[PDB]
């Protein structure tokens, strides 16, 4: 999930854009 | 700004700024 | 805090605070 | 949509909770 991937470890633009509609 | 630890409201804000008019979904449990 | 005009990052923040661990989806166009 | 209902007019807790998962 996003919190594991972007809070508990370092986020990336690839990860964030996976959650855009 | 996105290549760091983003937690809580900071993460919701990054999504807001990156996704723009597309909007986004924020699911912290799943 | 929710019974006002909420635009932009203010709205994303209200959703964040109201929905809590449930998370939310933010769709401004649709 | 949420922007019409909560930005362009006054939001409510009922409206906001419709968009929780």
Q: Count the domains in chain C.
A: 1
The CA–CA distances, whole Å, from C10 to A18, C1, C6, C14, D1 equal 23, 10, 6, 6, 16
Of the residues B6, B8, B16, B21, the best mutation for testing chain C's interface (the one with the most C CB atoms within 10 Å of its CB) is: B16
| B contact set with D (CB within 8 A) | 25, 27, 30
* Secondary structure letter of residue B21 according to DSSP: G
**Structure's resolution in angstroms:** 2.1
Q: How many of the other CB atoms lie within 10 Å of CB of C5?
A: 12
Q: How far apart are CA D13 and CA B11, in angstroms?
A: 22
Q: Which domain holds residue B15?
A: 1-30
Number of residues that this document lists for chain C: 30
How far is the C-alpha of A7 from the C-alpha of A20, rounded, in Å? Answer: 17
Helix, strand, coil in percent for chain A, rounding step 5: 50, 5, 50
Q: In the 8-state DSSP scheme, what is residue C26?
A: E
Polymer length in residues for chain A: 21
The b-or-e profile of B10-22 (16+ CB within 10 A means b, else e) is: ebbbbbbebbeee
Report the C-alpha gap between A1 and D15 in whole angstroms.
Answer: 26
């Amino acid at each position: 999930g996003i919190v594991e991937q972007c809070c508990a470890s370092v986020c990336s633009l690839y990860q964030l854009e996976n959650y855009c509609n | 700004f996105v290549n760091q630890h983003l937690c809580g409201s900071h993460l919701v804000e990054a999504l807001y700024l990156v996704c723009g008019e597309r909007g986004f979904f924020y699911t912290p449990k799943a």
